[PDB]
C-alpha cells in the first residue's frame, strides 16, 4: 500500500521488464505530494539516469543514497505509477528536490 | 404488478434514465421494494469488473460488477427492458463475489 | 490523510458509520469501496448482523444495503476494526442475497 511522496526516489517498472538495467525498470524522483499521488494514481516525476554529460537541466545526486546518477529535470512527466508497480528506493535530500523544482520551474516559465 | 427478477435488465429513474442488471431474486425484491443491481454503461474501458452484454438484447454496453448497490425499484419506476443470459449473471456474481471476499 | 479503508474496518462517512467489505487493495486504487450501513435493529431489516460492544458504535450492519460508493469524497475516517466473524456473517448474508 505504498504511496510515493515528494522527494522519494522510486523504482518504476516500465513494460520491458526483462533485461534488468537494459530494460524498462527506471529510477525516478517524485515531485508531486502523496495527497495527489494516492488519489489519482498518477504522479509528476523526473527520470534518473546513470551518466551525466553536463547539460543545464541535470541535477546530480549526492553519494550513498542507494541510487547514483543525475535527475533529468527537463524530462519531468505526468505518469501512472500504479501500473508501473512503484517501489521506494531512497529519499532525495531537500536541496536536490529544491534544485530540481527550480530548474523545472524555469523550464516551464514559472 | 411487475417485480424485477435476478437477471432482468431494467430501466431505473434517477433525479428511463439508466439501465441496470438485477442480481437479487424476485422473492426479496417483491417483498422489500428494494433490490441489488449493477449499472449498465456504454463506456467500456477494459476495466476488469466490466461484463459485456451480448449483442441483440435491447441494451448495449457492459455491466459494472463492482458498482452494485441496493436500490428502491418501486420509487425508481423499474421497467423491464430485456433479460441477460445465465453466463453474464455468473460472471458478474463471480467478479463481485471475488471483490467482496466471498 | 494517509488513511485507506480496509475490509472489516468500521468507518465514519459523511452524507454515518459503515462496515467496509472490499479490501484496501481495491479501495485505495479506485477511491471506491463496497460498504454496508450501521443502524439500529428493526423488524423490517431481515439481514442484520449485530455489532459487539466497545467498538465506538453499537447497532447492526445491514448486509442487504451494501453499496458501491466513493469514500474519498465522503472523508472516510477509521472508527474501529470489526471482528472477523462479523465480516464473515455480513458476507454470508449478502452473498445469498446476490444469488451466489
Amino acid at each position: 500500500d505504498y504511496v510515493p511522496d515528494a522527494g522519494h526516489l522510486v523504482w518504476l517498472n516500465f513494460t520491458p521488464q526483462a533485461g534488468h538495467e537494459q530494460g524498462g525498470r527506471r529510477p525516478a524522483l517524485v515531485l508531486s505530494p502523496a495527497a495527489y499521488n494516492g488519489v489519482t494514481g498518477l504522479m509528476q516525476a523526473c527520470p534518473v539516469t546513470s551518466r551525466a554529460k553536463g547539460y543545464p537541466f541535470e541535477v546530480t545526486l549526492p553519494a550513498h543514497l542507494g541510487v547514483s546518477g543525475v535527475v533529468l529535470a527537463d524530462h519531468c512527466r505526468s505518469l501512472d505509477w500504479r501500473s508501473r508497480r512503484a517501489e521506494q528506493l531512497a529519499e532525495a535530500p531537500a536541496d536536490v528536490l529544491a534544485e530540481v523544482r527550480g530548474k523545472l520551474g524555469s523550464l516551464l516559465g514559472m | 404488478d411487475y417485480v424485477p427478477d435476478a437477471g432482468h435488465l431494467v430501466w431505473l429513474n434517477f433525479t428511463g434514465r439508466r439501465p441496470a442488471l438485477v442480481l437479487s431474486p424476485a422473492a426479496y425484491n417483491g417483498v422489500t421494494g428494494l433490490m441489488q443491481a449493477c449499472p449498465v454503461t456504454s463506456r467500456a474501458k477494459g476495466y476488469p469488473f466490466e461484463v459485456t452484454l451480448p449483442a441483440h438484447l435491447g441494451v448495449s454496453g457492459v455491466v459494472l460488477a463492482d458498482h452494485c448497490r441496493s436500490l428502491d425499484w418501486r420509487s425508481r419506476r423499474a421497467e423491464q427492458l430485456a433479460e441477460a443470459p445465465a453466463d453474464v449473471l455468473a460472471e458478474v456474481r463471480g467478479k463481485l463475489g471475488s471483490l467482496l471476499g466471498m | 490523510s494517509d488513511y485507506v479503508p480496509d475490509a472489516g474496518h468500521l468507518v465514519w462517512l459523511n452524507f454515518r458509520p459503515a462496515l467496509v467489505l472490499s479490501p484496501a487493495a481495491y479501495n485505495g486504487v479506485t477511491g471506491l469501496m463496497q460498504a454496508c450501513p450501521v443502524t439500529s435493529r428493526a423488524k423490517g431489516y431481515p439481514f442484520e448482523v449485530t455489532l459487539p460492544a466497545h467498538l465506538g458504535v453499537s447497532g447492526v450492519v445491514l448486509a442487504d444495503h451494501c453499496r458501491s460508493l466513493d469514500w474519498r469524497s465522503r472523508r472516510a475516517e477509521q472508527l474501529a476494526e470489526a471482528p472477523a466473524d462479523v465480516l464473515a456473517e455480513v458476507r454470508g448474508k449478502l452473498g445469498s442475497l446476490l444469488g451466489m
Binding site: 501512472d80 | 422489500t32 420509487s75 471475488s98 | 458501491s68
Partner: peptide, 30 residues
C-alpha cells in the same frame, strides 16, 4: 476469479467512478 489478478488489471486509465443514481429515493437508507 482470483481477486489479485482482477485488481492487477485496474489502472488509472480504465477506472469507472461512482455511478450517479441522483438523490436517495424511497426505502433506500443511504
Amino acid at each position: 476469479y482470483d481477486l489479485a489478478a482482477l485488481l492487477a488489471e485496474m489502472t488509472p486509465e480504465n477506472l469507472h467512478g461512482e455511478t450517479d443514481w441522483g438523490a436517495l429515493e424511497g426505502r433506500e437508507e443511504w
